[PDB]
Design a protein around this ligand. Sequence first.
Ligand SMILES: CC(=O)/N=c1\sc(S(N)(=O)=O)nn1C
Ligand SMILES: [Zn+2]
Length: 257
Amino acid sequence: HWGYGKHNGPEHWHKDFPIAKGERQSPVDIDTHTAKYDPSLKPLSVSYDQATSLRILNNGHSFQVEFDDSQDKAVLKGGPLDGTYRLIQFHFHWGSLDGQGSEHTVDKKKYAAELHLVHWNTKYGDFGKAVQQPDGLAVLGIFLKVGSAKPGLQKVVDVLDSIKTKGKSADFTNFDPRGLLPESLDYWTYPGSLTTPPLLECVTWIVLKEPISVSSEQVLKFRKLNFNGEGEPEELMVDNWRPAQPLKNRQIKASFK
Ligand SMILES: CC(=O)/N=c1\sc(S(N)(=O)=O)nn1C
Ligand SMILES: [Zn+2]
């Protein structure tokens, strides 16, 4: 099975998922001096006031918080998007050390972690259909840097002990994802892919310029999770990030000058 270890990590994925060597793979390095300002780009519209969180799960590759996406409760619109995209879950990627952990890089700089807010395009009716379309998903990427604690993240950090191993889940209601956003919504955007298998090239990536800061104690907690299931030999959940992929025939656009 695929993973992030030496024998089943990102450089092995292409044997089971040949699109790994595809034309619009993610993540990528964002070169700030060659990104193109596009003033036709609209401001992002984030409407999370009615979000309904349900559950948090250790999926063996990360942990994810799931939302009710049965109606237009929490949606993303605007930006480079046409149409409305519903939030279905968020998850993180992080490192073993503070100098690594993000998937995207900015002028080759890595961040300590990267938050992904995953949304799907409601014109396709459900998530499984949306991933088969080039404009099926929109993922909001937010960088984490180590510094001062983020209050809005503590409720997440506090329940990780209850989902330590693969396949564990816990009730996680009334979580407000607005507490995870930076102050500014300026962004870069490019067409790309899911960054874990099946690596489908169905994503409009929206990567926020401004990182959020978390404390060392907060990220430490991330690092105490386990890839393994209960009763199995312990393998700490760290470095669950894919390296930057070739940009190839793509342009990164910026919403800001
Ligand atoms: C949200 C979901 O069900 N899946 C995902 S989201 C994703 S990511 N990391 O956001 O590009 N990769 N995969 C496989
Ligand atoms: Zn992700």
